[PDB]
Amino acid sequence: GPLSGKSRESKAKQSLQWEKLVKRSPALAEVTLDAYERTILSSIVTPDEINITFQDIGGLDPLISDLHESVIYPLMMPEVYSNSPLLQAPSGVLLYGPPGCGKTMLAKALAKESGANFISIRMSSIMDKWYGESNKIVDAMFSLANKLQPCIIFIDQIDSFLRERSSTDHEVTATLKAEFMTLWDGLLNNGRVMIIGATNRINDIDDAFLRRLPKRFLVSLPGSDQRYKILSVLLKDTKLDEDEFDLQLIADNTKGFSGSDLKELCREAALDAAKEYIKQKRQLILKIRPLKTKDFTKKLRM
Amino acid sequence: GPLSGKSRESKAKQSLQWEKLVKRSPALAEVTLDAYERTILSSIVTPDEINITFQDIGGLDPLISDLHESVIYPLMMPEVYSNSPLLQAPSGVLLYGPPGCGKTMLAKALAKESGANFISIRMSSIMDKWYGESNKIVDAMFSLANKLQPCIIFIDQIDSFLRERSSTDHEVTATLKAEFMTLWDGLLNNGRVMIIGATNRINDIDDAFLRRLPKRFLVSLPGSDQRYKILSVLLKDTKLDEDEFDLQLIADNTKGFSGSDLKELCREAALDAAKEYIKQKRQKIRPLKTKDFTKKLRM
Amino acid sequence: GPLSGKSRESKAKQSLQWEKLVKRSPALAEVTLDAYERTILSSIVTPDEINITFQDIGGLDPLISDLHESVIYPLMMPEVYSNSPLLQAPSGVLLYGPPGCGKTMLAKALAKESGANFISIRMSSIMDKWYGESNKIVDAMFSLANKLQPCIIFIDQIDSFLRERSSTDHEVTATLKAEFMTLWDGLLNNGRVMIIGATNRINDIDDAFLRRLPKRFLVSLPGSDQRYKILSVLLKDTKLDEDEFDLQLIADNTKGFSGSDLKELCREAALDAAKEYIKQKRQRPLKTKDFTKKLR
Amino acid sequence: SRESKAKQSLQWEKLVKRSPALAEVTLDAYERTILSSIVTPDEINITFQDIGGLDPLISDLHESVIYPLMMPEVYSNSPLLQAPSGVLLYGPPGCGKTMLAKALAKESGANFISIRMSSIMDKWYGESNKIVDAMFSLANKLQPCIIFIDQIDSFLRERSSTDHEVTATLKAEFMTLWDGLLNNGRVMIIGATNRINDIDDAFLRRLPKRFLVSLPGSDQRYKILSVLLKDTKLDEDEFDLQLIADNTKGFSGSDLKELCREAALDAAKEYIKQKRQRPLKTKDFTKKLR
Amino acid sequence: GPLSGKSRESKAKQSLQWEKLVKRSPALAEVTLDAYERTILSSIVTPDEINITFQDIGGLDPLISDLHESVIYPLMMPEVYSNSPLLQAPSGVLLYGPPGCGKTMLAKALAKESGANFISIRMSSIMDKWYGESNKIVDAMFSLANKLQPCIIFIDQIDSFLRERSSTDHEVTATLKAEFMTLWDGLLNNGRVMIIGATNRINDIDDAFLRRLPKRFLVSLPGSDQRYKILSVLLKDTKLDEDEFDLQLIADNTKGFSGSDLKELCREAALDAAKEYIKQKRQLSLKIRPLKTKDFTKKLRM
Amino acid sequence: GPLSGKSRESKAKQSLQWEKLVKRSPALAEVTLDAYERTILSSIVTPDEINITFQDIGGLDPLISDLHESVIYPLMMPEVYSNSPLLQAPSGVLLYGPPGCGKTMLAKALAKESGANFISIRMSSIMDKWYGESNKIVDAMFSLANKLQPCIIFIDQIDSFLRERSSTDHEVTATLKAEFMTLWDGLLNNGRVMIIGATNRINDIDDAFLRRLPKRFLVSLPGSDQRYKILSVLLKDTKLDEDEFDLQLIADNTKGFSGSDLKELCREAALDAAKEYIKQKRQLSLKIRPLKTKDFTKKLRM
Numbered sequence A: 001g002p003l004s005g006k007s008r009e010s011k012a013k014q015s016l017q018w019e020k021l022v023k024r025s026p027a028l029a030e031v032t033l034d035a036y037e038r039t040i041l042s043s044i045v046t047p048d049e050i051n052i053t054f055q056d057i058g059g060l061d062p063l064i065s066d067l068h069e070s071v072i073y074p075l076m077m078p079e080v081y082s083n084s085p086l087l088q089a090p091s092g093v094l095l096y097g098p099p100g101c102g103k104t105m106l107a108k109a110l111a112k113e114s115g116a117n118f119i120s121i122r123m124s125s126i127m128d129k130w131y132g133e134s135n136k137i138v139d140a141m142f143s144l145a146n147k148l149q150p151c152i153i154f155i156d157q158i159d160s161f162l163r164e165r166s167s168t169d170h171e172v173t174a175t176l177k178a179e180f181m182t183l184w185d186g187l188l189n190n191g192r193v194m195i196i197g198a199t200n201r202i203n204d205i206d207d208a209f210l211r212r213l214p215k216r217f218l219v220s221l222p223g224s225d226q227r228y229k230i231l232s233v234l235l236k237d238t239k240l241d242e243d244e245f246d247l248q249l250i251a252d253n254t255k256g257f258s259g260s261d262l263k264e265l266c267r268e269a270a271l272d273a274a275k276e277y278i279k280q281k282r283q284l285i286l287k288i289r290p291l292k293t294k295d296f297t298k299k300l301r302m
Numbered sequence B: 001g002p003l004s005g006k007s008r009e010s011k012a013k014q015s016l017q018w019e020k021l022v023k024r025s026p027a028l029a030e031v032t033l034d035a036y037e038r039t040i041l042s043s044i045v046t047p048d049e050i051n052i053t054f055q056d057i058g059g060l061d062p063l064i065s066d067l068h069e070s071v072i073y074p075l076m077m078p079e080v081y082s083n084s085p086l087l088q089a090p091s092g093v094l095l096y097g098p099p100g101c102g103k104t105m106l107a108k109a110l111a112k113e114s115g116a117n118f119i120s121i122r123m124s125s126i127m128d129k130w131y132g133e134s135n136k137i138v139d140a141m142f143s144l145a146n147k148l149q150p151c152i153i154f155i156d157q158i159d160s161f162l163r164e165r166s167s168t169d170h171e172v173t174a175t176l177k178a179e180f181m182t183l184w185d186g187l188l189n190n191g192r193v194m195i196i197g198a199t200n201r202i203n204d205i206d207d208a209f210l211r212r213l214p215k216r217f218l219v220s221l222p223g224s225d226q227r228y229k230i231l232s233v234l235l236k237d238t239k240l241d242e243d244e245f246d247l248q249l250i251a252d253n254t255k256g257f258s259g260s261d262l263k264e265l266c267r268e269a270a271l272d273a274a275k276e277y278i279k280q281k282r283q284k285i286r287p288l289k290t291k292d293f294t295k296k297l298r299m
Numbered sequence C: 001g002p003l004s005g006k007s008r009e010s011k012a013k014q015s016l017q018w019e020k021l022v023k024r025s026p027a028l029a030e031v032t033l034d035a036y037e038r039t040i041l042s043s044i045v046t047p048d049e050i051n052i053t054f055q056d057i058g059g060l061d062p063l064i065s066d067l068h069e070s071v072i073y074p075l076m077m078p079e080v081y082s083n084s085p086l087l088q089a090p091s092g093v094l095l096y097g098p099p100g101c102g103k104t105m106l107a108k109a110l111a112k113e114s115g116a117n118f119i120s121i122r123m124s125s126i127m128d129k130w131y132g133e134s135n136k137i138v139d140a141m142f143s144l145a146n147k148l149q150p151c152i153i154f155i156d157q158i159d160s161f162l163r164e165r166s167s168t169d170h171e172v173t174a175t176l177k178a179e180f181m182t183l184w185d186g187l188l189n190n191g192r193v194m195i196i197g198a199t200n201r202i203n204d205i206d207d208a209f210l211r212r213l214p215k216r217f218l219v220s221l222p223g224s225d226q227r228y229k230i231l232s233v234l235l236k237d238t239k240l241d242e243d244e245f246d247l248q249l250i251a252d253n254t255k256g257f258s259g260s261d262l263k264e265l266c267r268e269a270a271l272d273a274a275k276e277y278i279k280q281k282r283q284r285p286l287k288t289k290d291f292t293k294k295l296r
Numbered sequence D: 001s002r003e004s005k006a007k008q009s010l011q012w013e014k015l016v017k018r019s020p021a022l023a024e025v026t027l028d029a030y031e032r033t034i035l036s037s038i039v040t041p042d043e044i045n046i047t048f049q050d051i052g053g054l055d056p057l058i059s060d061l062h063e064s065v066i067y068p069l070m071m072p073e074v075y076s077n078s079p080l081l082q083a084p085s086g087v088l089l090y091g092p093p094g095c096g097k098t099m100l101a102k103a104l105a106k107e108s109g110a111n112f113i114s115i116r117m118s119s120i121m122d123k124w125y126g127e128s129n130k131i132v133d134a135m136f137s138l139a140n141k142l143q144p145c146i147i148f149i150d151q152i153d154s155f156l157r158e159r160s161s162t163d164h165e166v167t168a169t170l171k172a173e174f175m176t177l178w179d180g181l182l183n184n185g186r187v188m189i190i191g192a193t194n195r196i197n198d199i200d201d202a203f204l205r206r207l208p209k210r211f212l213v214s215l216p217g218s219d220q221r222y223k224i225l226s227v228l229l230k231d232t233k234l235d236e237d238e239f240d241l242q243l244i245a246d247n248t249k250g251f252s253g254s255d256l257k258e259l260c261r262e263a264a265l266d267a268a269k270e271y272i273k274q275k276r277q278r279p280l281k282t283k284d285f286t287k288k289l290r
Numbered sequence E, F: 001g002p003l004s005g006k007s008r009e010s011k012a013k014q015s016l017q018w019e020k021l022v023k024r025s026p027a028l029a030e031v032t033l034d035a036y037e038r039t040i041l042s043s044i045v046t047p048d049e050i051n052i053t054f055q056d057i058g059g060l061d062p063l064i065s066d067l068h069e070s071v072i073y074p075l076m077m078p079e080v081y082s083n084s085p086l087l088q089a090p091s092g093v094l095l096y097g098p099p100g101c102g103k104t105m106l107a108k109a110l111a112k113e114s115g116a117n118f119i120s121i122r123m124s125s126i127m128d129k130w131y132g133e134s135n136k137i138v139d140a141m142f143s144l145a146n147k148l149q150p151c152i153i154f155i156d157q158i159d160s161f162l163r164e165r166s167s168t169d170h171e172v173t174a175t176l177k178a179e180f181m182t183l184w185d186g187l188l189n190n191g192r193v194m195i196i197g198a199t200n201r202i203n204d205i206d207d208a209f210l211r212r213l214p215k216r217f218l219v220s221l222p223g224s225d226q227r228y229k230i231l232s233v234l235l236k237d238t239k240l241d242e243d244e245f246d247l248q249l250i251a252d253n254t255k256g257f258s259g260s261d262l263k264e265l266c267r268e269a270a271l272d273a274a275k276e277y278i279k280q281k282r283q284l285s286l287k288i289r290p291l292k293t294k295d296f297t298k299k300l301r302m
């Protein structure tokens, strides 16, 4: 058994994740897991833990539709695509581009809406100082993904785990990467198991690992209409002026703005728009003023 | 388990920090911690460890007000800002500018007055020779900040921690930076956790790491009025001449002077003004005059 | 495990330095040190190791007086300077100027006669190939300097230690310098701890690192009176003829002439004045003629 | 490597053979790595007597280097009579700075660290600085020590921000250990170079005694020719060494050695041909010159 | 019940060693031994087992004399040294240095000529998988050494038995080392019991164990005169040509050679010198050819 | 006894090897063994298990002769070498060099022709997860090698065992190496026991272990004549065309080829020559085809 994951809170988290998985998939109750796979179970992300929905992603509607029709529907609905063997889901999916464009939000929406079991694994859980523990951890990760047959394995910042191999790499790290390469695509074919990765450095990933991510989505910087959609999504459920507000000017004048930059701009604009409301409530501890174009003009450069 | 948290002095420091945190926040007694989180607990900076007040900072009054209204109140008073989802605290805060302008001063004031639990982590504690211990250290730091729900993780000199990723980066360093990037903004959203960093080289920070510091404060070189306020703050509770001392001359003639430079100038002026009293004591302090400050100023 | 000690000679040196520190300051016997702090302990210079005092430095009398009144008395006498918040010792001290002007011996006299526990770190001990050990070494150094509360950390040739940070800098060195800047002036204030450096390239020092050295002493090339004082200091307990010796002329003829060069000139004058005496030993007082013979 | 450890054992054996008191001295691993670069008088075949044309320079070098470092008891009356911290042998190339270093290593017999930049330089982080520290510590342990760095202008070049990090830190550590607070014993580092101006002033101060081994004069060239042409048959009537010395104008020691070697080979060429199947004269010397 | 030495041959060896000890010391017949002490008795080195004499060690005459005057005579002749309490033998002796210099030769000479009962214990005879057996083995070893009152306990390669303690040490190893420390120098003072140890890595030994070895002997690499003495000892009772052999030249040109290296060189030189005699004996010249210098030069790098 | 000797087929193998040893040496009937010695018995290589003859090794005739007169004859014929005490067999033999040059062939020929009892033991059978079992295993290994008095303890890849000692070594591994050092050359002298090692990285062996291997054979890369002899002995009992096959050129162009490389080249050339005959045999020319230079050169680089 793995020496890590023996904590009482760890066991409680594993039991909680297993109960959630069994509640979502009743057929999962007949599946028995190893101790290593039970340790991997703590990295499962349920739909509940995610508050991001595909409707909360703006400016990526063609990308969202392509991701659905090429990733989610083949993986989650194999009966429709069973007519031809070339209609299967890809073994790997890579979301790459400049930071802040929505790769992590797309991964969150995949965790929430796809319906596939999701493992958001981090390298802290994979790495272990003891000999041979990391290889068994990856083996358990792949075996658990095979057991929860429609599974997605997510590795955020995948350019570090799947970095280019070299002689200067650590022996345990190199063996771990080789084991991941073998289990990803080897003699024993996986089931409906997909490894989804998000990264900013596309060229830092090993060629043998980039080959295992054949479906690549370029979440690039948003355009003017894309920025308008992102701003409309961010400024949803937030009151805006019916006459003075002009979202087109904000979308056009945010040249070279990522989604996170637009989120910070919206947060700042809402803060200085409601400053009067926080001033009133701080004395106690009316209504928040609808957002105006001018509030965006002060914190933008024209 | 972890490494370097097993020393008796280290365990005593962890127990002291946990006791201070529980005393400050009585609801924190029910929180249980892993051994890695206990190791991170030695990096906790409590308000009693900081002697620096927000009123002890001069020349940054609009910066202090903006930092308050956009950082502290959304983080520490979510009930006021709960009406709208866009009124939340920033994911990260960067205090960047020329050295000596008061970035560490603002960080100390945040550690003392914000009321947020504060972790001042240094990369000596994060780094570990053993394999995979540093990634677990990062994960423990983030989980501890999540448990102490209004937490601020402070990383002084964040340009080295968040350096731009390269193919020549060390494998442990690169995996550590990727793990910090994932936990900073990933699938599992953090609570009221904000990472505050101070740096002189903002360009050395990675673009994806500058992404996670969306609220940026430029603590630039002080102006004439800013120098006036800084020198007035430094010379507080220190005797000054009523008629023979003029401070506007010192503020105007200290062109291109940071707060540290003004502190050193004030220290030298006090030293060679009270040298006579020091010589008498070695065997009252004279009021400070503007002639003394002109003596120590090259102009 | 710092991997820098763990040797019989290293452990013996560390125990010797700790015994000397406890003998100098009896209050240190209750202080417990970590393994990394014990590794740092080997770089500690006790006053008995230094054979140079303040009376062996000449031509820099107002620099010695200013260094005393601005470094030693604020640091070693807190009760005298406790009246005002602007009378504390500096967080850093920089000795800069042309080489051979008297900065290394000034640091020697600081290690000998100031009274503070003295740490003369060389970058080789700090530079460790293993991951994260250099930063732990720096942290242990700062914690040990805080434990021995009156302390001075000396970095000779601080220009390369505190060089300007760049993208071409190694990752371990960049984190080392960042950790040094954090512990030098960060959230956790140091005690009576200051960092003193002697260098010849002040411009090579990083601006943020130069900021942490606010009390900067400029040791320039000596003047005529300064060179005369240096020659008088270098010629003590030696035979000088009353009528023949003219030290003033030797002082003026040494234009642009450093203290190390003054030592070299004095040692060459002694050599070619006592050549006959040492030849008789194997088998003449110092005058202006022999000094001007070596000079040009 | 096995060969490196064998070389270290070789040098250690030779040094304890010369100095019986060195058996109790313990060495660090980096100290043994430095000891691998230590040369001995046995492998050097050049004597101070073989240094012709530099008699006044040889006498001054002896008086300022050999005796104050080998006889502390004679010079113990005055601290100013001690050996210098560094000695620089600068001048035009081919004048015999390297052979001066070999004669210094041989006749003095000191523990000679004839060390190079390649042995100091290492790819791993912090290795070169530890190498320099162990070099100076080993020089402190073997108290009669001279450290030689041939072509020291490249090693002690002017410091700049353009310099690489590792070599700049290396130069800073060498600067610290050359004259620092932990004062060395009878340790003296000697450099031979052709570009004295290329050496940093901070390193210039650390070689206070300098040696200008210059272009030989007519008498100096005659002494060089007389010294290097020993154990050779010369016809008394035919030979005229003064004319040969006066003919070579502006010729370095290396040029004189090459000219004499060419003349001797041309003289002995006939004999070699006969073996396969004559004394040296002024005509062969004058014919080679243009 | 020690569960070791239960075999018939081990019991026979124990009985033979006890008989030899009783023959050597007639007063030893009154001593009754426990079963664990009988198990320790298998490690007794009676001097007839050793063939090495002190004379058989060359180049260590000052070391041999110092070892005698400071180790053997204070231990074996306490009547002479009983005038002052500071003249007793040390509680431990460490022989350290590069391998092949003669530490085991000195230990063999001590086993053969000192006259002290010698126990050459090994880690296999100490370690036991059963609980608490190894500590009882060490206790029996110390009690037996006390019973055979002039005794020497030898632990070859002592850097492994007395390695530096750590929290990563095995429980039985840490308990064993603590028990050895307690019995070595504790409340109950030992008799004329000395723990002589030979090692190559003195720095690997624990500081608390190096303390219990206060008399340290450095058997370093031999010098030219020392190598000449070693070669003279090794080439004794061997035919060498008077006119042709030059031992001094071989001693100079065997630079950086340990005693074992010189032994191997002498063996190879004698082999290639006598090869003719072996070639003549295999057919079944005459007498063995006396060894000359060239037989050593051909096997030397020089 | 340990857990290794409790298996049924392991006990059968041990009984078979003991029967073979008694059949080869009739004096071995009276010798009895401990349980650990019986487990060591399973690592003993009988000469009939080896199909490699000293004549099967080509190009190493000077090395084979030197190995014989310096290693085998002193060990196997002590009556001939008993006139001089310096003619004994070395305590250790090291075969080092680039891989594929014939070190394992030399060890096989030593196992089959030398006549010594051969212990070719691997480190898995030495290592044990239990406390102190590895030390007892090596102690029984040396005791058994002493009982079968002419014995060879061969450890292939001797660099992994006998590696340079370090503080990062496992405690059981460190005690194992120390026990091997003590039994190899300690107080209790071994009989005609010699440890033969084969390795590629001679520098990885510890200095104290390299000392215990004084006789060293450098099996370097074959030269032109050496490669000619290796190809001649590899192409034995094989039909070769007298007129067309010129082995000298094939020996000339295999620059840098080891013995394994020449073996693979010969195998490929033989397969290419016999492809037609083998295809014909699968359907059932009718005779084998003599080898030619063209088949060897087509696999080679001119």
Ligand SMILES: Nc1ncnc2c1ncn2[C@@H]1O[C@H](COP(=O)(O)OP(=O)(O)OP(=O)(O)O)[C@@H](O)[C@H]1O
Pocket (backbone or CB within 6 Å): A056, A057, A058, A059, A060, A098, A099, A100, A101, A102, A103, A104, A105, A106, A198, A199, A200, A219, A229, A230, A233, A234, A258, A259, A260, A261, A263, B185, B208, B211
């Ligand atoms: N398409 C989008 N629509 C609305 N908001 C977005 C979009 N993309 C990004 N954001 C905002 O940016 C923030 C972070 O985005 P995200 O973490 O997905 O970036 P990323 O492209 O994955 O970069 P990184 O790989 O560095 O995390 C989110 O909190 C979100 O509010």
Ligand SMILES: Nc1ncnc2c1ncn2[C@@H]1O[C@H](COP(=O)(O)OP(=O)(O)OP(=O)(O)O)[C@@H](O)[C@H]1O
Pocket (backbone or CB within 6 Å): B056, B057, B058, B059, B060, B098, B099, B100, B101, B102, B103, B104, B105, B106, B198, B199, B200, B219, B230, B233, B234, B258, B259, B260, B261, B263, C185, C186, C208, C211
């Ligand atoms: N704005 C200010 N008002 C008053 N004092 C100041 C100010 N800025 C700096 N100082 C003085 O300078 C000292 C150090 O300042 P601080 O460490 O905050 O500089 P910094 O901007 O963080 O630069 P660095 O990041 O290089 O440390 C403080 O002790 C403080 O007394």
Ligand SMILES: Nc1ncnc2c1ncn2[C@@H]1O[C@H](COP(=O)(O)OP(=O)(O)OP(=O)(O)O)[C@@H](O)[C@H]1O
Pocket (backbone or CB within 6 Å): C056, C057, C058, C059, C060, C098, C099, C100, C101, C102, C103, C104, C105, C106, C198, C199, C200, C230, C233, C234, C258, C259, C260, C263, D179, D202, D205
């Ligand atoms: N002011 C002085 N009085 C007497 N001797 C001096 C003086 N300055 C330098 N010296 C001589 O120089 C040596 C000390 O070196 P010094 O302190 O000059 O180095 P430095 O100025 O720090 O230059 P660097 O930074 O290159 O080390 C002593 O041996 C001493 O003889």
Ligand SMILES: Nc1ncnc2c1ncn2[C@@H]1O[C@H](COP(=O)(O)OP(=O)(O)OP(=O)(O)O)[C@@H](O)[C@H]1O
Pocket (backbone or CB within 6 Å): E056, E057, E058, E059, E060, E098, E099, E100, E101, E102, E103, E104, E105, E106, E198, E199, E200, E219, E230, E233, E234, E258, E259, E260, E261, E263, F185, F186, F208, F211
């Ligand atoms: N001083 C010596 N005189 C004669 N022979 C020696 C001497 N030292 C070593 N030898 C030869 O070396 C062989 C083994 O030496 P020994 O085992 O004593 O080495 P060691 O120093 O104990 O190294 P290790 O601890 O690795 O065994 C002996 O058989 C002996 O022939």
Ligand SMILES: Nc1ncnc2c1ncn2[C@@H]1O[C@H](COP(=O)(O)OP(=O)(O)OP(=O)(O)O)[C@@H](O)[C@H]1O
Pocket (backbone or CB within 6 Å): F056, F057, F058, F059, F060, F098, F099, F100, F101, F102, F103, F104, F105, F106, F198, F199, F200, F230, F233, F234, F258, F259, F260, F261, F263
């Ligand atoms: N001299 C030789 N004559 C004939 N065949 C040889 C010779 N040397 C090697 N070979 C062939 O090489 C093969 C490999 O065995 P070999 O003895 O070369 O291993 P080795 O040299 O010890 O290399 P390693 O160290 O990798 O085991 C053998 O099957 C043998 O057929």
Ligand SMILES: [Mg+2]
Pocket (backbone or CB within 6 Å): A103, A104, A156, A198, B185, B186
């Ligand atoms: Mg992301």
Ligand SMILES: [Mg+2]
Pocket (backbone or CB within 6 Å): B103, B104, B156, B198, C185, C186
């Ligand atoms: Mg700061």
Ligand SMILES: [Mg+2]
Pocket (backbone or CB within 6 Å): C103, C104, C156, C198, D179, D180
């Ligand atoms: Mg200096």
Ligand SMILES: [Mg+2]
Pocket (backbone or CB within 6 Å): E103, E104, E156, E157, E198, F185, F186
């Ligand atoms: Mg031994």
Ligand SMILES: [Mg+2]
Pocket (backbone or CB within 6 Å): E181, E182, E185, E186
């Ligand atoms: Mg005790």
Ligand SMILES: [Mg+2]
Pocket (backbone or CB within 6 Å): F103, F104, F156, F198
């Ligand atoms: Mg093999």
